[PDB]
Design a protein around this ligand. Structure first.
Ligand SMILES: Nc1ncnc2c1ncn2[C@@H]1O[C@H](COP(=O)(O)OP(=O)(O)NP(=O)(O)O)[C@@H](O)[C@H]1O
Ligand SMILES: [Mg+2]
Ligand SMILES: [Mg+2]
Length: 443
């Protein structure tokens, strides 16, 4: 928060009634399991719990007051009563954002939101020479609760901000972009694999363009079939386009190449100038993500060497498609952190991109249909599937003849010890499968 707020100065702005003593808070929490001194607790209802049941707990941990939508009789701390706590949270987020005066960029899309966010954050942090001065959305806190929680983290040390906006329903981004009011808005794409109908998806992403600053820059994907609709909706605003295919885009990539790890490198071209960029990430889609981040960074005033350095400094998250090369010349992709069926299919797509022998190495997801569909999707796409775990017995069957189930990791590892250079191996499983032990044994 840019400054502590006083409950009695919010009755008007939140349409609230103060019950009990006045209080001043310098941060907010929506969770009794993660709150401490000086903080406002916000009581939300969900499918599993009701926040209003935890007032004793938050008072004991030092919360100064609770924002509630029903009065709790004889509460152990002051209450600020409103009709809808989701909307009061939204308003608090908007109010904090209006105190912040630095550059703010936002991005939406079907896929690549988080990655463009980390890329852009890396660029701005690299240019500033300090990580703490750039606020970015933590994890995936991007929905109608996540966004105002992120905006509430805006604080006196921040100089710029990078805000992820999720669009899984119509009107969600219309609401969150109005709280956020970015200077630059990015749409990565609409309608990518494994992610309301196509026209709804296009309309939902485009909502970002409505909250954009009046001469704010729109960053748009010239390859996307919805480009012309997004361009119209962007109305007057300055526009920067990116593309892997078109010479007239503002940001372009030439001469795409993988390094020995499999990570993508390219020549950046366009209006920021030309340079070679070596990412630490896999997949052609991450080149498009880099161009979108570069475009935004350029709109914000970052020079070329800041863009390049920021893109090259970004590392993958541990166990999230980390490509490495063993001393034996084996390519091992560590994706052992976690897995769900959708993430499995995204993994398989990455692996099928490689041209020599490909070995998919799987542990169980933490049921039968899903394993079944994962193995089937892999079939005809990678050279082999090695797996461990009883649910993974269903994947191997659906995969076919070069698929092998193993009794424990120990025999899986002995099999992989036999693979030669030019082979790519991808290792993935739920956290409970502990497939990082296989990674460690090879690397
Ligand atoms: N530009 C892109 N085009 C197509 N696929 C992509 C792109 N960027 C990322 N992906 C795929 O989507 C996965 C998730 O990347 P991420 O950057 O976390 O997307 P996201 O938009 O934040 N997803 P979510 O917040 O879960 O809606 C990656 O591991 C890739 O498989
Ligand atoms: Mg994400
Ligand atoms: Mg995300």
């Amino acid at each position: 928060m840019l400054e502590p707020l006083r409950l009695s100065q919010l009755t008007v702005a939140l349409d609230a009634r103060l019950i009990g003593e006045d209080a001043v808070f310098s941060a907010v929490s929506t969770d009794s399991r993660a709150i401490g001194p000086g903080e406002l607790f916000i009581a939300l209802s969900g499918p599993r719990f009701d926040g209003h049941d935890y007032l004793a707990e938050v008072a004991a941990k030092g919360a100064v007051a609770a924002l509630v939508e029903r009065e709790v009789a004889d509460a152990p701390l002051p209450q600020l009563l409103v009709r809808d706590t989701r909307a009061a949270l939204g308003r608090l987020g908007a109010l904090n954002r209006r105190k912040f005066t630095g550059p703010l960029a936002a991005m939406t899309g079907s896929s690549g939101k988080t990655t463009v966010k980390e890329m852009l954050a890396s660029i701005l942090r690299t240019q500033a020479g300090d990580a703490e001065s750039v606020l970015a959305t933590r994890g995936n806190l991007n929905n109608d609760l996540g966004v105002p929680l992120t905006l509430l983290q805006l604080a006196p040390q921040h100089r710029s901000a990078v805000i992820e906006l999720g669009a899984s329903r119509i009107g969600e981004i219309a609401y969150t972009v109005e709280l956020t009011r970015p200077h630059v808005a990015i749409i990565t794409n609409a309608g990518t694999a494994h992610v309301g109908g196509p026209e709804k998806i296009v309309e939902a992403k485009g909502e970002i363009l409505e909250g954009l600053a009046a001469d704010g820059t729109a960053v748009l994907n010239l390859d996307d079939k919805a480009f012309d609709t997004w361009k119209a909706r962007a109305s007057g605003r300055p526009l920067l386009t990116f593309s892997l295919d078109r010479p007239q885009a503002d940001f372009r990539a030439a001469d795409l190449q993988r390094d020995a790890r499999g990570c993508m490198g390219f020549r950046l071209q366009g209006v920021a100038g030309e340079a070679q960029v070596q990412l630490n990430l896999l997949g052609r889609h991450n080149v498009a993500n880099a161009l979108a981040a570069a475009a935004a960074a350029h709109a914000l005033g970052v020079p070329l060497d800041g863009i390049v350095a920021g893109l090259q400094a970004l590392q993958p998250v541990k166990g999230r498609a980390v490509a490495q090369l063993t001393a034996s010349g084996l390519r091992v992709i560590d994706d052992s952190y976690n897995a769900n069926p959708a993430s499995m299919l995204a993994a398989i797509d990455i692996l099928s991109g490689f041209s020599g022998r490909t070995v998919l190495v799987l542990g169980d997801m933490g049921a039968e249909q899903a394993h079944r569909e994962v193995g089937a999707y892999a079939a005809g796409k990678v050279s082999a599937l090695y797996a461990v775990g009883p649910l993974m017995a269903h994947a191997v069957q659906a995969f076919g003849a070069t698929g092998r189930h193993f009794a424990d990791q120990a025999s899986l590892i002995g099999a992989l010890a036999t693979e030669d250079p030019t082979t790519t191996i991808l290792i993935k499983g739920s956290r409970s499968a502990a497939m990082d032990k296989v990674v460690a044994a090879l690397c």
